[PDB]
Amino acid sequence: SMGNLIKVLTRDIDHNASHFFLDFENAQPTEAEREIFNQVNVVLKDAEGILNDLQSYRGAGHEIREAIQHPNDENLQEKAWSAVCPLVGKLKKFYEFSQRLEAALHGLLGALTSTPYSPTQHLEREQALAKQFAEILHFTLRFDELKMTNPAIQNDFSYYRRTLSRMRINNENEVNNELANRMSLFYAEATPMLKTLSDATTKFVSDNKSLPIENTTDCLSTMASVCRVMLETPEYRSRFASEETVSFCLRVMVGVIILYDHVHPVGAFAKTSKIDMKGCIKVLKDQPPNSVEGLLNALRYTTKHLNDETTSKQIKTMLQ
């Protein structure tokens, strides 16, 4: 049922572009999925506004550089402050939305990693939740791809913190030092949303001591192979691979690979791993470079076991 797993994960997304929530009537969640599907779909619904606010993040680099150049001109200091404050408000909204992804992820993992059923049976029984999990990873990579290309995010927040301290000594919606420290560590990450999801998955394995870790890791590796097989077999490429479906599974694949590398003890590159690392990197390399470079850079730096001595030198050359 490799073909069925592909149709389940890639259903109603060709006729659906740039939407992360699932239509309740179209997804058809079972009675056991209803309470989790509704809660996660509320987060996925708000995920569109988060991504559009990041696409519209213009930055305040122009006003900041003029204020730094003329530091005694209070009009330029107030103009830069008036431009950076609503941008910091967006950054505060992005970080708080990352906390909502952790709550929705626990509900999905708790249902997709039940004790008796296998990973393949879970993705077929809980189709609506399995589809929601892929949408969370789809938004996660798409958010981080934009953040990696926008250097004004860290520059605007760093200027905000420096100005706030030397403005709260000289002369409600403001950001306290405790929240600012967590936000600074959040945006210092290469993939902030993916690092957040990676820690939440490690938390889920830790919170369920009586649950075998394979129920979680083999769930990630199953989804990775579903996307890899469809993208590398022309018999499935001529049947499902569209620009919307390819870009969807490219980001789902890289997402579960990085989660698997942080959760599985030996990592995603070791000889006991279940991820076909060579096959996954090849799929990314066979794509136009401009639409994958953000995903490749995630594998070069965000990963945990890439630079290990156990990791094959063959894939290290692929990732160069």
Author numbering: 0 to 170, 176 to 324
The authors write:
Previously known as FAM49B, CYRI-B is a protein that is highly conserved across the Eukaryota and has recently been revealed to be a key regulator of Rac1 activity. Our structure, the first to be reported of any member of the CYRI family, reveals a protein that is entirely composed of α-helices and organized into three distinct subdomains. The similarity in structure suggests that CYRI-B interacts with Rac1 in the same manner as CYFIP1 and therefore regulates actin-dependent processes by competition with the WRC for Rac1 binding.
We therefore produced SeMet-substituted protein, which allowed us to determine the structure of CYRI-B by SAD phasing. Solved by X-ray crystallography at 2.4 Å resolution using the SAD method, the structure reveals three distinct, entirely α-helical, subdomains and high structural similarity to a conserved domain of CYFIP1. The native and SeMet-derivatized protein crystals have similar unit-cell dimensions and belong to the same ortho­rhombic space group, P212121. In both cases, a single molecule is present in the asymmetric unit. The two models are nearly identical and could be aligned with a Cα r.m.s.d. of 0.29 Å for 320 atoms. In both the native and the SeMet-derivatized structures, the flexible loop composed of residues 171–175 was too disordered to build and is therefore missing from the final models. This loop connects helices α7 and α8 of the medial subdomain. As presented in Fig. 2(a), the native and SeMet-derivative proteins migrate as a single band on both native and SDS–PAGE gels. The gel electrophoresis and SEC results corroborate the crystallographic data, confirming the monomeric state of CYRI-B in solution.
